[PDB]
Amino acid sequence: MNLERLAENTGEFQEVVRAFYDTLDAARSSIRVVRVERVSHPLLQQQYELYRERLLQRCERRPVEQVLYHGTTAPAVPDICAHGFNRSFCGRNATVYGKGVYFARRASLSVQDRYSPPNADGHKAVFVARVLTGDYGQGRRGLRAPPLRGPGHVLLRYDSAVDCICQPSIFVIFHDTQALPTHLITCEHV
Ligand SMILES: NC(=O)c1cccc(N)c1
């Protein structure tokens, strides 16, 4: 089982839900958390953990890791739990900042129907993922990998692509072990 239902009497549940509603902005009043589930994929967790340690040694930017959101469709949920996030299933809607997996800093964005469309029961899927944003650069329509660092840098590419280099709200990640789905929020409209 890649999904374990979290009980409301736990601190883990209350931290996920508090962080969700804090970033829900104008939607805070219009969205109800139905269910919270822990995502279990030990191989990815362990691989993510190694990636994390190498970025802590290397990166000029702190923090190396952010807790971001990813709204998805109901049929894509078993895929992410079992295999993690896959940039090859770019079907979703668009890839205006590159052909990667899109993460939002605020649940207010991921909770929009175009990202988390409700099923027939009105349940909307929003993954909580630990993402290794690292050193980021500007996203663009052509990107198949992170943006180029350009002159003044030893490395050729950044770790992630962003919507705005000044005040980022969207992060695009282009590596299979760079984002770890830790929870699934099943929410709905009031
Ligand atoms: N699918 C998503 O949650 C998401 C997050 C940030 C930006 C975009 N376009 C989508």
Instruction: Tell me which residue has its CA closest to atom 9 in ligand 1.
Output: 102
Bridge partners, residue 127, by sequence: 70, 184
Ligand 1 atom at minimum distance from 163 CA: 7
46: left (phi over 0), alpha (psi -120 to 50) or beta: alpha
115 lines ligand 1 (CB under 6 A): yes
102 lines ligand 1 (CB under 6 A): yes
SS3 content of the chain, % helix, strand, coil (to 5): 25, 30, 45
Q: Say whether the peptide bond before residue 63 is cis (omega within 30 degrees of 0).
A: yes
Are 149 and 77 a contacting pair, CB within 8 Å? no
70 lines ligand 1 (CB under 6 A): yes
The CB density around residue 165, as the number of other CB atoms within 10 Å, is 12
181 lines ligand 1 (CB under 6 A): no
The CB density around residue 53, as the number of other CB atoms within 10 Å, is 11
Inter-CA distances, 118 with 104, 114, 172, 187, Å: 18, 9, 23, 9
Distance CA 33, CA 107 (A): 12
> What is the resolution in angstroms?
2.6
170 lines ligand 1 (CB under 6 A): yes
Residue ranges of domains in the chain, CATH in brackets: 1-190 (3.90.228.10)
